[PDB]
């Protein structure tokens, strides 16, 4: 029924609100709170390992909160563990980078990072200017579309719930979950007159891979660096 589709939309939004780490209103309220030049210089003078370690902890924390998101979605716990692991492996870092747009301010090209807004410059010590620039771009393109909370909650669910990921054992059970979300998302977009937004979405697979690679690298090499 119509209210049944409406139920699932509000419940995906609920699950998103509960697992999104920081509230949008807090993020929006803190736009004026910007790192000073002194504070920028502090981050830039950190060792490459110090800065990577911090950001990998954040990236890790983000992935865990996407897992919590997935756990609350309708049929996810009912899938076999193998499928749960396949969907989250293939999908979580992409969800993380889409969530990231909410902490991005497109007016001043800054992002909320450890309690204040800062630009690309903050992340010089990472030694990956191109990756940082690309992620800022992706965030900029996402913010421009001016997602509702519902749009993000539903779109990120669809990033996860995908019956096309290699190595599922129960494709059909994923397909039903994916279709149900598609049906719900389609109704919501139609009633809001937002059908066209998903045509405009910037490519996220490559970037997410590189974030995932870096996370893997830091854990792999942790014994050649100071105790965490």
């Amino acid at each position: 029924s119509l209210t049944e589709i409406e139920h699932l939309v509000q419940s995906v939004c609920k699950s998103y609100r509960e697992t999104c780490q920081l509230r949008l209103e807090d993020l929006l309220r803190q736009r004026s709170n910007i790192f000073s030049r002194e504070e920028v210089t502090g981050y830039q003078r950190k060792s490459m390992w110090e800065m990577w370690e911090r950001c990998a902890h954040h990236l890790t924390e983000a992935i865990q909160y996407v897992v919590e998101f997935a756990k609350r979605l309708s049929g996810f716990m009912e899938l076999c563990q193998n499928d749960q692991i396949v969907l989250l492996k293939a999908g979580a870092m992409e969800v993380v980078l889409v969530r990231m747009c909410r902490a991005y301010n497109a007016d001043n090209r800054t992002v909320f990072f450890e309690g204040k807004y800062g630009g690309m410059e903050l992340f010089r010590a990472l030694g990956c200017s191109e990756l940082i620039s690309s992620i800022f771009d992706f965030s900029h393109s996402l913010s421009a579309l001016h997602f509702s909370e519902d749009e993000i909650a539903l779109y990120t669910a669809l990033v996860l719930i995908n019956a096309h990921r290699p190595g599922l054992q129960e494709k059909r059970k994923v397909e039903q979950l994916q279709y149900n979300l598609e049906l719900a998302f389609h109704h919501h977009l139609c009633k809001t007159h937002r059908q066209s937004i998903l045509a405009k979405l910037p490519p996220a697979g490559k970037l997410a891979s590189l974030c995932s690679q870096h996370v893997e690298r830091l854990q792999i090499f942790q014994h050649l660096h100071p105790i965490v």
Binding site: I63, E68, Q84, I85, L88, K89, A92, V215, R217, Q219
Partner: peptide, 15 residues
């Protein structure tokens, strides 16, 4: 297919 992420995700799925 990255093994770093799988470990985080496995650990997170418990409990």
């Amino acid at each position: 297919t990255n093994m770093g992420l799988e470990a985080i995700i496995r650990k997170a799925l418990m409990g």
